[PDB]
Amino acid sequence: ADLEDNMETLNDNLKVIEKADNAAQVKDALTKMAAAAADAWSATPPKLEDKSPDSPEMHDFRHGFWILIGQIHDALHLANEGKVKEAQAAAEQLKTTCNACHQKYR
Amino acid sequence: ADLEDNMETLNDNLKVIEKADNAAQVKDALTKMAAAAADAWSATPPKLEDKSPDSPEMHDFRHGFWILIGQIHDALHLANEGKVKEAQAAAEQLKTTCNACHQKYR
Ligand code: HEM
Ligand code: HEM
């Protein structure tokens, strides 16, 4: 999928997690988030189209997804273990990663 | 996929990395490893079929995959950044995670 589709998937599923009741709902949403972030990892955003794949900006951009995917994975681990509230807390904190990349590159 | 299929994917792609020449080869192999490890995360192995999903053994088993996925992810980052030799060194070291789980549960 393209960047915008992956980002909508990320956003929709974050909302699902916030209001989820059980571990199955949270696990599913984070699983979809992991796939969407992985798909987006390789993408070149509009604001960086004129930059080289090896530019400081693109290294920074890809590093943001590496951070995000690690956070999603750790949240998913908690969901796997039935730790609903704590996974929801992890999902809340990773918004900082969403925000930080948007700040620079959206 | 079942455990055996995911493990074959894990094994075959590790061999690919070992003898890879460029970053594209390593990135592709690690991407496939990530998917296979994620798919195997929820699996109940033959030796643990009589155990509860909340048993100490299944907690230990799932934790091994959490570790492996994080290691694959970190290697994949290196591969994405064109760091071939260093990604290959990362793939070498995670064999310890493969071996440790097999030691107990294979
Ligand atoms: C789970 C965390 C994140 C959420 C919930 C999120 C959400 C969104 C949303 C709702 C949009 C609006 C565009 C659309 O989807 O139609 C967007 C755009 C964008 N996001 Fe994210 N985002 C997240 C993380 C990230 C990260 C980590 C990066 C970079 C490493 C990133 C880079 C971008 C860029 C460059 C755009 C603008 C795309 C365009 O204008 O075509 N996002 N994001
Ligand atoms: C990159 C690391 C790994 C590699 C290369 C690897 C490789 C393999 C291979 C080749 C097999 C034999 C499959 C077959 O042909 O029947 C196997 C089996 C198995 N592995 Fe792994 N493995 C890895 C990681 C892990 C981890 C981390 C765990 C535990 C958390 C694990 C648990 C098992 C189990 C339970 C079996 C037996 C499956 C069955 O009998 O159905 N493996 N592995």
Question: Which key phrases capture this entry?
Answer:
homodimer, 106 residues, mainly alpha, Four Helix Bundle (Hemerythrin (Met), subunit A), 5 helices, binds protoporphyrin IX containing FE, transport (chains A, B), periplasm (chains A, B), iron (chains A, B), signal (chains A, B)
Protein model, in words:
It is classed as metal binding protein. The entry lists the keywords Electron transport, metal binding protein. Two copies of one chain form a homodimer. Chain A is an all-alpha fold and 106 residues long. Chain A has a single domain, classed as Four Helix Bundle (Hemerythrin (Met), subunit A). The first copy, chain A, is built from five helices and no strands. In chain A, helix 2 (23-40) packs antiparallel against helix 3 (56-80). The longest helix of chain A has 25 residues, at 56-80. The radius of gyration of chain A is 14 Å and the shape is elongated. The interface between A and B is medium-sized, with 17 and 16 residues.
Helix-strand layout with pairing:
The structure is a homodimer of 106-residue chains.
Chain A: H1 3-18, H2 23-40, H3 56-80, H4 84-93, H5 95-105
The structure holds protoporphyrin IX containing FE (2 copies).
One protoporphyrin IX containing FE binds at residues 3-4, 7-8, 10-11, 14, 45-46, 61, 64-65, 68, 97-98, 101-102, 105-106 of chain A.
- What oligomeric state is this? homodimer
User: How many beta-strand runs of chain A?
Assistant: 0
**Share of residues in strands of chain A:** under 5%
- Which bin fits the share of residues in helices of chain A? over 70%
Biggest interface reads: A-B, 17 and 16 residues
Shape of chain A: elongated
Named CATH topology of chain A = Four Helix Bundle (Hemerythrin (Met), subunit A)
> Hetero groups bound?
protoporphyrin IX containing FE
Separation, N- and C-terminal Cα atoms of chain A: 17 Å
CATH architecture of chain A: Up-down Bundle
Number of domains of chain A: 1
CATH class of chain A: Mainly Alpha
Q: State Rg of chain A.
A: 14 Å
CATH superfamily of chain A: Cytochrome c/b562
**Alpha plus pi helix count of chain A:** 5
For the report, how would you describe the main beta sheet of chain A?
none
SSE succession of chain A: HHHHH
Task: State the secondary-structure class of chain A.
Answer: mainly alpha
Family (chains A, B): Belongs to the cytochrome b562 family.
GO molecular function, one term (chains A, B): iron ion binding
Subcellular location (chains A, B): Periplasm
Biased composition (Basic and acidic residues) (chains A, B): 47-60
